[PDB]
Amino acid sequence: ESLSEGLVEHVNEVQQQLMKTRKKRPIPQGWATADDVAALQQVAYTDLNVTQASSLDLENECAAVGGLDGKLDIYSVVANKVERTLDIGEPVTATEWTGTKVVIGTAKGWVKVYDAGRESATFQTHAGPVTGLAVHPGGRILASVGVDKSFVFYDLETGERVARGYADAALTTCAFHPDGNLFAAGTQTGHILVFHTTTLEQAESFPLGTPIQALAFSENGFWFAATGKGTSSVTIFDLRKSGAAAAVKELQTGEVLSISWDYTGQYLATGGGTGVTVQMYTKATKSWSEPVRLGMPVVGVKWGGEAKRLVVVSREGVVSVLGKKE
Questions:
Q1: In whole angstroms, how far apart are CA 281 and each of 150, 223, 256, 291, 302?
Q2: Strands laid side by side in the 287-294 sheet
Q3: Judging by beta carbons within 10 Å of its beta carbon (0-12, 13-18, 19+), is residue 293 exposed, middle or buried?
Q4: Distance CA 135, CA 204 (A)
Q5: Is the CB of residue 193 less than 8 Å from the CB of residue 183?
């Protein structure tokens, strides 16, 4: 399916505005310093209601955690409280915030949006599991990908599916470019496919070689990070290059199930079965380092405000906040 002229214009206007915004101030005032990040340690933790946690998203210090047990928990970082449990009744395979609402994907091919505990929109759009979700930075378009090799776009303003594209392989994860006019989907066969958002046409493919487990763009607009199942590293790809030559950096991370690249593009957080890391890119010296390495096994990580907190969750449903102690 194809995008309406009005949605195309929206994507192109959002692209223009987000390009301007990040270039005016790449580093917001008050952001976490390198020493702040290096000093990160656990300052709080609590047991969620969910177990078999699969996915985490964070917005304004509010965490949403979906589980393969068919539950979705909402957790307040600042109140240190589980605020709500939603009984989905299907294993939750992906979780994302859309403004004040939470979107989930399920093992049964459903994408569902919730407004404070109530369904507000549902779509049965995939055959078998939804494997990933991505929220377009304009706040209107939602994307889902599935093992059924398709990716679907939705218009949250109208509550309708608006487009569907197909890949040559089962899809495992996805992400929008920070400016929104590119959409990336990882494949089970080990490639990252990049599509133009308005046309859903594939523009290029990047090789990794293992099923894509996590994917994140940098706010610098030309890098993205990807990691493959069974590997212990993260690869940085340069969108301005092609093929195997586009892999410009390999970072030794251990197993990475989840990546969070902060707004400034300086701090690439990872989490997996052997712990949490932060890989830091220092632009002034064009060099990478690892200020953070902790042992706690996790399945999701997300930067909090100003990258001064990192929120992480284990498969058993323990949410932990890493931050400045005292």
A1: 34, 12, 18, 10, 17
A2: 258-261, 267-272, 275-282, 287-294
A3: middle
A4: 21
A5: no
Are the C-beta atoms of residues 297 and 277 closer than 8 Å to each other?
no
Three-class SS state of 12 = helix
What are the backbone dihedrals phi and psi of residue 283, each rounded to the nearest 5 degrees, phi first?
A: -65, -40
Method of structure determination: X-ray
Count structural domains, the chain. Answer: 1
- The resolution, in angstroms to one decimal, equals 1.6
Helix then strand then coil, % of the chain, to nearest 5: 10, 55, 35
- The C-alpha atoms of residue 69 and residue 324 are separated, in whole angstroms, by 33
158, 221, 236, 241 from 203: Cα distances, Å = 28, 16, 19, 13
Domain residue limits at 206: 1-326
Cβ atoms 313, 319 nearer than 8 A:
yes
Helix (H) or strand (E) holding 214: strand 212-217
User: Contact at 8 Å (CB) between 136 and 180?
Assistant: yes
| Tokens (6 digits) for 210 | 């293992």
Q: Looking at beta carbons, which pairs linking 185-194 to residues 24 or more positions away fall under 8 Å?
A: 185/132, 185/145, 185/151, 186/132, 186/211, 186/212, 186/213, 186/215, 186/226, 187/211, 187/212, 188/147, 188/212, 190/228, 192/224, 192/226, 192/237, 193/167, 194/239
- The end-to-end CA distance of the chain, in Å, is 53
